[PDB]
Amino acid sequence: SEPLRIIWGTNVSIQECTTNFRNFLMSFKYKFRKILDEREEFINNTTDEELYYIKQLNEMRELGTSNLNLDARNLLAYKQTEDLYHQLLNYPQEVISIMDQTIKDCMVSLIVDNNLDYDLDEIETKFYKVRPYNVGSCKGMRELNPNDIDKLINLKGLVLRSTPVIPDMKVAFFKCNVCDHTMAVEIDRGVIQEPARCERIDCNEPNSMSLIHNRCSFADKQVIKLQETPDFVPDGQTPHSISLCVYDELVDSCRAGDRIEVTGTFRSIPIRANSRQRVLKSLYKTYVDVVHVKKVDLAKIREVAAREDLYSLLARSIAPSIYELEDVKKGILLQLFGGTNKTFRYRGDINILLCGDPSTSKSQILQYVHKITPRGVYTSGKGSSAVGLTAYITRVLESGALVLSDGGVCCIDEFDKMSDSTRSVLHEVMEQQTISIAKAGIITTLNARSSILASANPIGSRYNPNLPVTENIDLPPPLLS
């Protein structure tokens, strides 16, 4: 008699699913997971008697966020959602909406159940979205097949480039031109449910509708070109690329060049052959619609601040591999500390040039000071020259490491191969601590404020100490001074 609802073509009930997940999230404690992860012999029961998700959902209403990180293996743990786990491997786009509506209903029930004095407006205003991760085995980009269409997968990869934020409509805002009635309609799969007339019976004028673009409510969409990680590639081919679409809060969660394990549904959309025609090509564009992104006190300072032996400790901590040249490592150490930025301006940073043979370990020291520093860039003298190390106009203004490392170390290896333009740039890098260029109508005066560590190469053989070494070094004496 009751007209129940069924997920399309699946014979799966809405009410059974939304009660199973609700009683799951009320009644899942972590000790049942400890049973079914075979971590019974390492139980910590004091973290296990309490409710694992109700505490987290009580933390979300206090912190102000509205996103729940969830792992799907607990669906294998609690029995009533066990088949629901297969739903997460089969029909993601429906059941994910079922979970986030259940989460919002659980905030409503938790506010109204314990009679906590909290306003319902702040609970119902925020949109709650579920973020499932750890659903199954990690899949390869080569092993992806068209059997995975409308399924939920995990991928491991690296970000090549990140587009700027793309607006996507969420509610279309329409206005009548003869009566100024401002109404709102719902966007569904990219087509606007446009009314033919007003909802007002008084005018009911046909064809009077206008779309007000700036008064519509929007959401974020960012496309990321994911690249396969080099550890799992076949030896014959380059790593492939896939489109990776993040939405809302997950936009700009992925930086550039970082390794990420991403969770999302694998979808294929038809690409349109002509801009003004409906004809669709047979080849389909594949993208991963993302539901989750997974990455990859001061008393400890004070206890080594009170020791009198911190000098040799930090001197052997910076380069444990190299035993000799303790003056070199303490000089680099004092470069990491540096002077204070003084203004009324004088530069406080010290500058270190290492003159030595390439076979003697110096690039290891440059790698170590690169890893130690919070800010700092390792670059090669042969790799970048002319105006590459400073700001150069490309495409925008892509600027080098001399301004990107404010207060940090710029470590230049093979410092003998600087071109004359680069010596002239570096002359105001050391003296004025400020680069300045005037190209393509753009004048920029950028604060360098950078500590430089250079390693130079003598020409050919190692050089005798009887006659002075500075004349062997190809660098000009204005840099040496």
């Binding site: 480039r161 990140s162 700027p164 607006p167 673009h213 700036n214 519509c216 929007f218 930086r255 550039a256 060049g257 700001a391 925008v396 203004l397 892509e398 600027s399 301004v403 990107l404 404010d406 109508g441 753009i442 004048i443 920029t444 950028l446």
Partner: protein, 101 residues
């Protein structure tokens, strides 16, 4: 914007162009039934200054290994030619969205 009907020389003025150049549809003369072919009145219409400056984030807030994201900023009225390229500068105003014209 002000336009004239090509049939009966009726005048429609205060047409507002949001993002594309638009012409009136219905002729206000009830005897005339014109729908297209409207001629613009250059003298009667009122114009404003326009400038589109393209900005990017400063080098202090650029993270490791990223191309700078860009944004188009519209200056209208008195604020034209106030901002020269290559300057650290603060714009206060409205974030808008523009369609494909």
């Amino acid at each position: 914007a002000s336009f004239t009907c090509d049939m009966c020389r009726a005048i429609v003025d205060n047409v507002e162009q949001s993002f594309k150049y638009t012409e009136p549809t219905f002729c206000p003369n009830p005897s005339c039934e014109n729908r297209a072919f409207w001629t613009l009145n250059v003298t009667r219409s009122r114009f404003l200054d326009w400038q589109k400056v393209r900005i990017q984030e400063n080098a202090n807030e650029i993270p490791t290994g990223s191309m700078p994201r860009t944004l188009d900023v519209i200056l209208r009225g008195d604020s034209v030619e106030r901002a020269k390229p290559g300057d650290r500068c603060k714009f206060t105003g409205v974030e808008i969205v523009v369609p494909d014209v």
